[PDB]
Design a protein around this ligand. Structure first.
Ligand SMILES: N[C@@H]1CO[C@H](CNC(=O)c2ccc(F)cc2)[C@H]1O
Ligand SMILES: N[C@@H]1CO[C@H](CNC(=O)c2ccc(F)cc2)[C@H]1O
Length: 330
C-alpha cells in the first residue's frame, strides 16, 4: 500500500504545516501537524476542556462506529517549547492520503496548553518519531507509520515541505519526480527515539565549506534551524546589523537586509537553504526588526534540523530494520 497527502503552511511564515487526516467511521477529517520529533497522535476532541478549544475541529469518538476506548490508557506530553497536552486514548481507523490503519491509537486531549488553544489551525499532532517515545501509559502505543509499515510497498515515508507553498507527505514510496539529482543517505541513531543523524558541516553564503560533525534531529514539527552557537554566530556575522536579542529570544536582523544562504552537508552532498527561507518577518507587527530562522541550540541540549532546513530538501525517512535518512535537492 501507499499514501500521499498534501501538507499546507498554517500561515504566511511557514510556522508549521497541516495535513488532513481521516479519523473514524464515518470519517472525521482533522488537520494535524505531522511531527517527526514526537511519537503521539493526539487530537482536539469532544473531551477537551471547553475553555481550551478556540476554533479547532474536534474528534468526537461517540460519533465513530469504529472507535473503542482503550481501557485505562492515559497520555501526557510536554514538548521542547514548553507546550503540553494530555488525556485518554481511543483506538480507531485512521487514514492519511489513502493509506489506512485500523486500530490506531488516537489520543484524545482533555487538556491542552495555551499555545495549542491559540493556534486555531492545528487540530492535533501526528507523531512520526520512533514509537519508543510514545507517552501512552501503561501500554505504550505505536505511531501511524509504525502500524502501517509492514503493509507499505516500502517501509519509508517522505517529507517534501514547501517554502510559502504546499508540499507533500508520501508513505510507502519514493516519488522520483519530486527531487533533482540523487538522494544521499546517512546513518540514523534511534537511541534517543529521534531521527538523529550527523551533518558533515556547513557554509555561509558563498563562503568555504567547514567540515565539522553536527549531530542533530530531522524534525518536521519544529519551525526553525537550531545549531551550535559557533555556527549560528558565523551565519549572522554576515548580516549587517544582526544581533542576538535576549529580550526577543534570539537573533534578529534589520528587515532591510538581504540574507545569505546556508548550506549543510549530508555526507559528501550539500543542501542549500536560500536566504529568504531564513526570514521569519517582523518581530511584532510594524517592526523593522525581523526574526531569524537560524538560532542557537545552546539552551536546548540538541541540534534541530527543523522546517527551515527540511523544506530546502526532499527528505526520506527510511524505516527499514536499520533506519536511515535521505536528502536530495529539489
Ligand atoms: N514565528 C516565529 C518563527 O518560529 C518561531 C517558533 N515557532 C513557533 O512559535 C510555532 C511553532 C509551531 C506552530 F504551530 C506555531 C508556532 C516563532 O516565534
Ligand atoms: N514549536 C516550535 O518550533 C517552537 C515554538 C516556540 C519556541 F519558542 C521555539 C520553538
Amino acid at each position: 500500500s501507499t499514501g500521499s497527502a498534501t501538507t499546507t503552511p498554517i500561515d504566511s511564515l511557514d510556522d508549521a504545516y497541516i495535513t488532513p487526516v481521516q479519523i473514524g467511521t464515518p470519517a472525521q477529517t482533522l488537520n494535524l501537524d505531522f511531527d517527526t520529533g514526537s511519537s503521539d497522535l493526539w487530537v482536539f476532541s469532544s473531551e477537551t476542556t471547553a475553555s481550551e478549544v478556540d476554533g479547532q475541529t474536534i474528534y468526537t469518538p461517540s460519533k465513530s462506529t469504529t472507535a473503542k476506548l482503550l481501557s485505562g490508557a492515559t497520555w501526557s506530553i510536554s514538548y521542547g517549547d514548553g507546550s503540553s497536552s494530555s488525556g485518554d486514548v481511543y483506538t480507531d481507523t485512521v487514514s492519511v492520503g489513502g493509506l489506512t490503519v485500523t486500530g490506531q491509537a488516537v489520543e484524545s486531549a482533555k487538556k491542552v496548553s495555551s499555545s495549542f488553544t491559540e493556534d486555531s489551525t492545528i487540530d492535533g499532532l501526528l507523531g512520526l518519531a520512533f514509537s519508543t517515545l510514545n507517552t501512552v501509559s501503561p501500554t505504550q502505543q505505536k505511531t501511524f507509520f509504525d502500524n502501517a509499515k509492514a503493509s507499505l510497498d516500502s517501509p519509508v515515508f517522505t517529507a517534501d515541505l514547501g517554502y510559502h507553498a504546499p508540499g507533500t507527505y508520501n508513505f510507502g514510496f519514493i516519488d522520483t519526480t519530486a527531487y533533482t539529482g540523487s538522494i544521499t543517505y546517512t546513518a540514523v541513531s534511534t537511541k534517543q527515539g529521534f531521527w538523529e543523524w550527523t551533518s558533515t558541516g556547513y557554509a555561509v553564503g558563498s563562503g568555504t565549506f567547514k567540515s565539522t560533525s553536527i549531530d542533530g534531529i530531522a524534525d518536521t514539527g519544529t519551525t526553525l534551524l537550531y545549531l551550535p552557537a559557533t555556527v549560528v554566530s558565523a551565519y549572522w556575522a554576515q548580516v549587517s546589523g544582526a544581533k542576538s536579542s535576549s529580550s526577543v529570544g534570539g537573533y534578529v536582523f534589520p528587515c532591510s537586509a538581504t540574507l545569505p544562504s546556508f548550506t549543510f552537508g549530508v555526507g559528501s552532498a550539500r543542501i542549500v537553504i536560500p536566504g529568504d527561507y531564513i526570514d521569519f518577518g517582523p518581530i511584532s507587527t510594524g517592526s523593522s526588526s525581523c526574526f531569524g530562522g537560524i538560532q542557537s541550540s545552546a539552551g536546548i541540549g540538541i541540534n534541530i534540523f527543523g522546517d527551515v532546513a527540511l523544506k530546502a530538501a526532499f527528505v526520506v525517512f527510511n524505516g527499514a530494520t536499520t533506519p536511515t535518512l535521505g536528502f536530495a535537492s529539489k
